[PDB]
A = this chain, B = another copy of it.
Amino acid sequence: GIYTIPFVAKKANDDSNSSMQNYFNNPAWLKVKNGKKMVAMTVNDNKTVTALKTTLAGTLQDVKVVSEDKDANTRIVEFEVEDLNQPLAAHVNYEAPFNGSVYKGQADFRYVFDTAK
């Protein structure tokens, strides 16, 4: 990475913060690779966040896992962003302990990058 970009994970259907805001470290890394804009960020709870997909060419595509650190329960993910100036639609799969079982959920949210800073 070279450029740093702050972001907020917002809800899918409103402008309030998503619960996903607690799961990513700020700011993200921003770089150009083969002419494309690549954003990288640390997922701070590797075990809970089981899958992450972001919008690319009209479909939700799995982010690239760059690095994984099971000892620290973190991983670094990277994804291509077509337009940094618009909210980016994302889809997450998660797992959490619940009343003696494992609750498996999924949700949509949006990344909003602070490009005007």
The residues of A with any CB-CB pair to B shorter than 8 Å are 19, 22, 45, 47-48, 96-99
Contacts and interface: CB of A to CB of B under 8 A. Distances in A.
A101 to B, nearest CB: 10
A98 B99 contact: no
Contacts of A48: 99
Stoichiometry (number of copies): 2
Q: Which 9 A-B pairs have the closest CB atoms?
A: A22-B99, A97-B97, A97-B98, A47-B99, A97-B99, A96-B98, A96-B97, A48-B99, A19-B98
Most chain B beta-carbon neighbours within 10 Å: one of A22, A45, A96, A99: A99
A96 B103 CA distance: 11
Given A96-B97, A97-B98, 4 more contacts: A19-B98, A47-B99, A48-B99, A96-B98
Nearest to A95: B99
9 contacts: A19-B98, A22-B99, A45-B99, A47-B99, A48-B99, A96-B97, A97-B97, A97-B98, A97-B99
